[PDB]
């Protein structure tokens, strides 16, 4: 009695993540349009460009939080409590948007989810690994099934939440996200006590006595430095929302710079950059492509948010092939290059409808279908150890930090140039990074 060849525990963690991803990507699929709505009612006094920037820096902070989430669980509170309380915080974040409020609830929701996802996401991934011995070949297959589940939740969420939004409004749809996380907590809590090892109720690598003080010092100085900067910003009149997003952008990008300066490994640099650039493009699906979907495609007969299901749809379709592919077959730097090339191609493709049909009309949904087909093909060359997982979340974070700057450039007037430039740039950088490495 297994779960697709794996210990029954995989099913628990599988569904936990699926429902977490459900709530996250359900919310993500309507959050931009929601902000558009708040803007249209004079409730939110920002440009659409800034709204787009918010989406990206939101994702960036979510991934940055995940970069330290593993650390907190492994050394302070434990992997199993981190997932649980992480889940609770996420649930609360969605509940906040379900409440009959407007723009004033946005920040609180974002904070809870950043902290919550930071606690949950790296650590459920950790718990998957705990289901096996250090020497078991199923480890790869098991984690592959796990990722299939992550995308299963990401697939159905925009369909369900998107349609719900169109039926009963935004707050009801957001509450469905909350309910989804609640389901995940149920399956995780009761299922976990039966499948998961109890040694992960506590930190497996607790802070040694002499480690606590210098850690505390470094956190204090960092937080103090950050706050001092914000003070200065408010004194000199740089306190607009983009100002804060720029601050966050700089912080997120500075982190690998000083983190890589620390070990300087120089072979890791092009790998990191390729990942950063790939995730930048991939994460623009929920922002730039979401915008294209709403403005440049006729979605008069279906929720336009449904386009967000295409990304994880292709993960699920490619998984059977690529599984067989690896059984029946490329260097790590090669995989990243070709992957980034596909990402670039996915944007070059998106440049065609505007150049061929103009930008003032509407084009076939198949353009976005083909685009996601291309970038997810690239993800297959990138997508599937506490330390490496951290670099993974970090690369994702920097990509979205970059997006926070980049997506503000996107509009109907700049559409073709935007997709062409960053599309061809990514293809070229793909070529450069494969030979540089
Ligand atoms: C088939 C799956 C293989 C994965 C890679 C495929 C990527 C290829 C994408 C090209 C398709 C995009 C073109 C869509 C298109 O032009 O249709 C527009 C319109 O004519 C349809 O009515
Ligand atoms: C894991 C470390 C993260 C450190 C930063 C903590 C979170 C800081 C900012 C959250 C990023 C969201 C900025 C956009 C935003 O707040 O929008 C608010 C609404 O527009 C209300 O006007
Ligand atoms: C366990 C360590 C981290 C603790 C996480 C606590 C998160 C800190 C602040 C989140 C702010 C949540 C309150 C915001 C809120 O409720 O929305 C505002 C009103 O509902 C809108 O009128
Ligand atoms: C302890 C688990 C909590 C999970 C339940 C979260 C959702 C709970 C109740 C649903 C709240 C739905 C709000 C409905 C609402 O805001 O009115 C709808 C619009 O304002 C007008 O159509
Ligand atoms: C306003 C929402 C607040 C909800 C608080 C509910 C708290 C109820 C019980 C606390 C249980 C916390 C421990 C759960 C945990 O560590 O997960 C491990 C479980 O053994 C299953 O893996
Ligand atoms: C607003 C954030 C400012 C930065 C937070 C800095 C302070 C955060 C946590 C302080 C933790 C208390 C240090 C003492 C300690 O952890 O010992 C507890 C051990 O478990 C004792 O056995
Ligand atoms: C550990 C729980 C408390 C930690 C979170 C408290 C708030 C933390 C940082 C505040 C946000 C810092 C970046 C500024 C920012 O996001 O802008 C927010 C919007 O400008 C709101 O108007
Ligand atoms: C150990 C990593 C820490 C590195 C932190 C580096 C932060 C250095 C400078 C941050 C300056 C904040 C930028 C503020 C800003 O861009 O405001 C400009 C606004 O766009 C004007 O409206
Ligand atoms: C080796 C020492 C050098 C430290 C490297 C830190 C990296 C600093 C900045 C990264 C560039 C991203 C800034 C983009 C940005 O936020 O634009 C805002 C402008 O600063 C003002 O409009
Ligand atoms: C596994 C089978 C389910 C496949 C359908 C998944 C649908 C998910 C998102 C749909 C997003 C909008 C795509 C619309 C579409 O493909 O129609 C294309 C028509 O040829 C339009 O002329
Ligand atoms: C393997 C399939 C990949 C398909 C993508 C390859 C597409 C190749 C080039 C697309 C770039 C077309 C841009 C056309 C263009 O820039 O028009 C300029 C006009 O002046 C519009 O402002
Ligand atoms: C695994 C490598 C992926 C290679 C992609 C294979 C497809 C190659 C080129 C497809 C280019 C699609 C351009 C769309 C196009 O030109 O048609 C325009 C519209 O159909 C007008 O009716
Ligand atoms: C990569 C070698 C290490 C040196 C890093 C120093 C510069 C760090 C990051 C460079 C990318 C900065 C992205 C910000 C950017 O492109 O701004 C775009 C505009 O601000 C859009 O408004
Ligand atoms: N970029 C990442 O690190 C994670 C993205 C992936 N789509 C997920 O939700 O798990």
Residue numbers in the entry: 6 to 269, 282 to 346, 351 to 405, 420 to 472
Copy text verbatim from the article accompanying this structure deposition.
POTs belong to the major facilitator superfamily (MFS), and therefore adopt a canonical MFS fold where two 6-helical MFS domains, the N domain and the C domain, cradle a centrally located substrate binding cavity (Quistgaard et al., 2016, Yan, 2015). The MFS fold enables substrate transport through an alternating access mechanism, which involves conformational transitions between inward open, outward open, and occluded states (Newstead, 2015, Quistgaard et al., 2016, Yan, 2015). Twenty-eight peptides were screened for binding to PepTSt from Streptococcus thermophilus, and structures were determined of PepTSt in complex with four physicochemically diverse dipeptides, which bind with millimolar affinity: Ala-Leu, Phe-Ala, Ala-Gln, and Asp-Glu.
The structures of PepTSt were determined in complex with four dipeptides that collectively represent substantial sequence variation: Ala-Leu, Phe-Ala, Ala-Gln, and Asp-Glu. The structures were refined to maximum resolutions of 2.7–2.2 Å, and were either in the inward open conformation (PepTSt[Phe-Ala], PepTSt[Asp-Glu]) or in an inward-facing partially occluded form (PepTSt[Ala-Leu], PepTSt[Ala-Gln]), which mainly differs from the former by exhibiting pronounced bending of transmembrane helices 10 and 11 (TM10 and TM11) (Lyons et al., 2014, Quistgaard et al., 2017). The backbone interactions of Ala-Leu, Ala-Gln, and Asp-Glu are similar to those previously described for Ala-Phe (Lyons et al., 2014): The N-terminal residue interacts with Asn-156, Glu-299, Asn-328, and Glu-400, while the C-terminal residue interacts with Arg-26, Tyr-30, and Lys-126. Ala-Gln binds in much the same position as Ala-Leu. Yet the glutamine side chain is bound quite differently than leucine: Tyr-68 and to a lesser extent Trp-296 have moved closer to it, thus narrowing the pocket around it and enabling the formation of van der Waals interactions as well as a putative N-H···π bond mediated by Trp-296. In addition, Trp-427 and Ser-431 have undergone rotameric shifts in order to form hydrogen bonds to the side-chain amide.
